[PDB]
Amino acid sequence: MQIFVKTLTGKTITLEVEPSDTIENVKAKIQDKEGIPPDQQRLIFAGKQLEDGRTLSDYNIQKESTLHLVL
């Protein structure tokens, strides 16, 4: 699976993954990429925030989509 993460600043970072549970775990994976710390980073897709610990699948998250994460 391929996913994209974007910021309002306009930079695009391309990331690779397949479904995992855990907002934290996704947060852990973004932690590794550019040496950017995730003490409280937010996930919106569908223009909505994703709460702690429920399945990614829920919401129909899917491949080649684009995401915008802000802390």
Partner: protein, 959 residues
């Protein structure tokens, strides 16, 4: 543009109602008796002309306060459609009033019985229908829309159904009708709570207090009684919803009945006939109820009935007078009365907002303005000191910024009061020294003109006489005639110029006080009541002005119980427009035609000057056909606060014209804060130098100390003891001269001290020496005089040095103290006429000590303090309310941010107030506003991250 008191159509309708129904004798039976007031007859004293007119006025009032309420962040009570009373249009309102004229015109008897009610309302709606039907050709096309409309309002008059609150029109007409019963129904406290609660549901609390407040003034203006409000009233509380009573029995508790989930439940209404150990509930008991203590502002409060200023006897005399009758008869009169009442109630609250002013006269000068005027005069006197980028006087350089500051801080009219005809004359000397160019502010594509040359040639061609009065008039003419001059001047004075020359800034700084002086001298015409000012402004800027003005109008209301003053205060300090008319000799006119037609202005300032504040001076001739212009230097403590903003026609260029009517209000709350010393300190340096040259010159010219002389005269004093001269001379040299020599020697040898100053006074007079015949007494005397000057020079030198040391430390008083020390002729007199310079500086400081430091916190320390407390509680409550702000979406964040901005400005108001009420010498205490500002910071960052989050979610949702 529509109003009750001006619209002639409404007045026509009311006049009709008076002529045909209202002014006609009661065709009833019970309580249909005619009333006699002052020996003049009125047939309907309970429901006559005064009644219906007052109700129309109520409609005007309630709509006004409703719109004010909406202009404040409030949310009025919505009807079936999303309309609130604040959505009533002028045309709709006109319909409502024209209808409101006949609402009680269908009456015959005064009886209240239901059948008589239905009948009289039938006759009322019929009367209305008739009147409309007759003038259908004038109303139906433009006043009304169709017979459907007039049928709606007629149906409202009919009131066959008992509905009262279905539409704005309904509420206005019915409530407007019944609220007029305050003056007659007692107990007052009972009804007032009822009516208040009934109006609060639609228009809001503050607007309601405003309504009943102004209502009292309406009663006073139509000579009807004004009910008191006694919170401790012990008459039985009358349940006004129907006619009923509240009863307490056994244990001092009211009759109640528990329900489903009320715990203790609703008071049982016991009809006025109750056979009951039980007791009736008094007024105060009712008001003190927990239900009525968080819903009614009158709980605990008191309103003194009658007329403040007179006893109830002669007040009763006022109630029964020709004006009551004329009120119930003369329509134009009644309308005029109510008009003045309302218009007054637009002005008085503004005055209540700020601490009071004692007198209308202009201020007295302070140190900085005295120094300023001295400087200005020295400029006019010696133009030799004027250069390219600075002015040098007594080794002191005066930049551009100095003169700009002078323009900014010094009450130039006051400074003008210290100039004279000599200074007026020196305008010629200034202009002969000058050939510099003045430019139009605007119109850079416009000619420049050498101001000195122009003035000189003008005075030579016109005022050949050199007549000083004519000079003054000519200065005023130069002000009002030549745009190349007053453009630059009025631009530089108000700190809104650009690329101006030092010559121009300086010349403006000099000409402003002179022009104001010329005005004050010339104008012997009475200060006009109404002035107009024309303005050409961009659309957006006009919009901003309308918003600010509306902010100031919306937050000031007449007082009933609760004091809504600190808010009006805060908003007026936040939005004040007065400074647009300040700092310069503003040009105005008393004829509207000038600003409206001739100059075609899109924004008009109407200045109401009833108390003769704002001292305006006539300019130019003033005949039929002139501009009728007047000039105003806005007093620093007087503000031009908006009473109304009105949309009038359009310009010739098409854009809408707005006319704002302002009212001048004088108060020490408007005086700006200015750190003193901006002018007086360089002046003190000037004097210090001027004296320095003198001290040096004297120190060098004259001989130093030789003390053999003293020693020799002492030795001779001891020698003349064996002289055969006289007993008198021996005793004179020994007893009188001897010790004087002793002290002179002592003082001259060490330091000084007063011993010198006293010794010089101990010197025997020439008359004493003259009493000793003629002998060797002369030969001793010239020695004594040599010594006297020896000490004189020393005393003057030390006095000068000490004074100068005093000047450096800016102590203006100590300088005077030293200078006092100079011996003056005799004692000293070995000094040439540089005594002129010295006594001149002494005079300069004598004059500088005549400064009148004007208080910023008059009498009302209590008002200022209480107001501050209210202000900071209000602001802190707003902030802490915004602290727990739940922000679920983006709109909420917008409103939160704008809120945060407005609060940010409020806090600075709080700050300035803290400054201006701090009396003494210490750091100002800002501890309370520090916490506030910190809260501002936190709930600013919170709002920021909330915002970027929400816009993130938005663009995410978009894809």
């Amino acid at each position: 543009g529509f109003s009750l008191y001006t619209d002639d159509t409404v007045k026509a309708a009311a006049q009709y109602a008076y002529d045909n129904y209202l002014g006609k004798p009661y065709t009833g039976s019970v309580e249909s008796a005619p009333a006699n007031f002052g020996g003049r007859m009125v047939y309907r004293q309970h429901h006559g002309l005064s009644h219906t007119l007052r109700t129309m006025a109520y409609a005007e009032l309630i709509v006004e306060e409703a719109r004010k309420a909406k202009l404040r962040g409030e949310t009025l009570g919505k009807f079936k459609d999303g309309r609130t009373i604040a959505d009533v249009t002028p045309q709709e309102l006109k319909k409502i009033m024209i209808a409101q004229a006949f609402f009680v015109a269908g009456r015959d008897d005064e009886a209240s019985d239901a059948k008589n009610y239905q009948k009289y309302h039938e006759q009322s709606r019929d009367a209305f229908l008739k009147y409309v039907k007759d003038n259908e050709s004038t109303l139906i096309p433009d006043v009304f829309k169709d017979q459907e409309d007039v049928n709606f309002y007629a149906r409202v008059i009919e009131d066959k159904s008992h509905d009262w609150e279905s539409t704005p029109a309904h509420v206005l007409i019915n409530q407007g009708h019944m609220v007029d019963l305050v003056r007659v129904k007692q107990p007052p406290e009972s009804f007032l709570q009822r009516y208040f609660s009934s109006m609060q549901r639609w228009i809001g609390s503050q607007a309601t207090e405003a309504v009943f407040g102004i209502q009292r003034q309406f009663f006073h203006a139509t000579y009807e009684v004004v009910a008191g409000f006694d919170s401790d009233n012990k008459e039985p509380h009358l349940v006004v919803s129907g006619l009923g009573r509240y009863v307490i029995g056994e244990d001092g508790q009211p009759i109640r009945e528990a329900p489903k989930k009320g715990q203790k439940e609703g008071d049982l209404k016991v009809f006025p006939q109750t056979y009951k150990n039980e007791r009736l509930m008094r007024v105060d008991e009712f008001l003190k109820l927990p239900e009525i203590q968080n819903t009614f502002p009158g709980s605990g409060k008191h309103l003194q009935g009658g007329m403040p200023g007179m006893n109830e006897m002669d007040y009763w005399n006022r109630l029964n007078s020709l004006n009551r009758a004329r009120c119930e008869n003369d329509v134009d009169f009644c309308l005029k009365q109510l008009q003045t009442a309302h218009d007054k109630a637009k002005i008085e609250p503004i005055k209540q907002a700020f601490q009071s002013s004692k007198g209308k006269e202009r201020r007295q000068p302070n140190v900085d303005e005295i120094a300023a005027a001295r400087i200005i005069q020295q400029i006019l006197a010696n133009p030799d000191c004027i250069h390219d980028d600075h002015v040098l006087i007594n080794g002191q350089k005066l930049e551009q910024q100095f003169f700009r500051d002078l323009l900014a801080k010094c009450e130039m009219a006051v400074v003008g009061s210290l100039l004279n005809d000599t200074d007026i004359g020196n305008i010629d000397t200034l202009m002969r020294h000058e050939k510099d160019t003045e430019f139009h502010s605007t119109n850079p594509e416009a000619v420049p003109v050498k101001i000195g040359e122009y003035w000189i040639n003008d005075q030579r061609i016109n005022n050949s006489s050199g007549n000083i009065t004519q000079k003054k008039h000519d200065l005023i003419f130069l002000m009002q005639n030549d745009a190349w001059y007053f453009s630059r001047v009025n631009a530089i004075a108000q700190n809104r110029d650009k690329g101006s020359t030092f010559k121009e800034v300086l010349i403006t700084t000099l000409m402003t006080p002179l022009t104001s002086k010329a005005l004050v001298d010339t104008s012997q015409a009475k200060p006009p009541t109404r002035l107009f000012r024309g303005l050409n402004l961009s659309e957006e800027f006009t919009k901003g002005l309308i918003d600010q003005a509306n902010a100031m109008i919306a937050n000031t209301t007449e007082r009933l119980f609760t004091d809504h003053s600190p808010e009006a205060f805060k908003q007026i300090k936040l939005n004040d427009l007065s400074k647009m008319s300040g700092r310069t000799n503003a040009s105005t006119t008393t004829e509207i035609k000038l600003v409206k037609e001739t100059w075609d202005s899109n924004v008009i300032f109407e200045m109401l000057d009833p108390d003769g504040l704002l001292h305006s001076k006539q300019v130019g001739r003033h005949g039929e056909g002139t501009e009728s212009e007047f000039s105003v230097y806005l007093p620093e403590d007087v503000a031009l606060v908006p009473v109304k903003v009105t949309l009038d026609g359009k310009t010739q260029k098409g854009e809408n014209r707005y006319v704002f009517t302002f009212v001048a209000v004088k108060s020490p709350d408007f005086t700006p804060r200015h750190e003193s010393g901006y002018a007086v300190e360089p002046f003190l340096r000037m004097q210090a130098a001027k004296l320095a040259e003198v001290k040096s010159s004297i120190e060098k010219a004259q001989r130093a100390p030789d003390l053999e002389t003293i020693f020799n005269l002492q030795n001779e004093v001891e020698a003349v003891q064996y002289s055969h001269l006289s007993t008198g001379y021996k005793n004179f040299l020994k007893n009188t001269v001897g010790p004087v020599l002793e002290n002179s020697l002592s003082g001259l040898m060490e330091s000084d001290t007063d011993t010198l100053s006293k010794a010089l006074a101990a010197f025997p007079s020439d008359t004493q020496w003259s009493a000793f015949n003629f002998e060797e007494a002369r030969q001793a005397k010239r020695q004594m005089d040599a010594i006297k000057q020896m000490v004189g020079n020393k005393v003057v030198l030390d006095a000068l040095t000490q004074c100068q040391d005093a000047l450096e430390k800016q102590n203006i008083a100590g300088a005077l103290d030293a200078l006092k020390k100079i011996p003056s002729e005799k004692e000293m007199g070995t000094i040439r006429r540089e005594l002129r310079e010295q006594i001149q500086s002494a005079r300069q400081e004598l004059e500088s000590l005549q400064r009148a430091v004007v208080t910023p916190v008059v009498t009302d320390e209590k008002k200022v303090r209480e107001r501050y407390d209210a202000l900071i509680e209000n602001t802190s409550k707003k902030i802490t309310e915004l602290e727990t702000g739940k922000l679920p979406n983006l709109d909420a964040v917008k409103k939160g941010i704008s809120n945060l901005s407005n609060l940010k400005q409020e806090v600075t108001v709080l700050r300035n107030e803290k400054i201006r009420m701090h009396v003494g010498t210490d750091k100002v205490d800002f501890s309370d506003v520090e916490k506030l500002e910190q809260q501002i910071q936190v709930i600013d960052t919170k709002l920021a991250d909330a915002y970027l989050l929400e816009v993130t979610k938005q663009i995410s949702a978009l894809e």
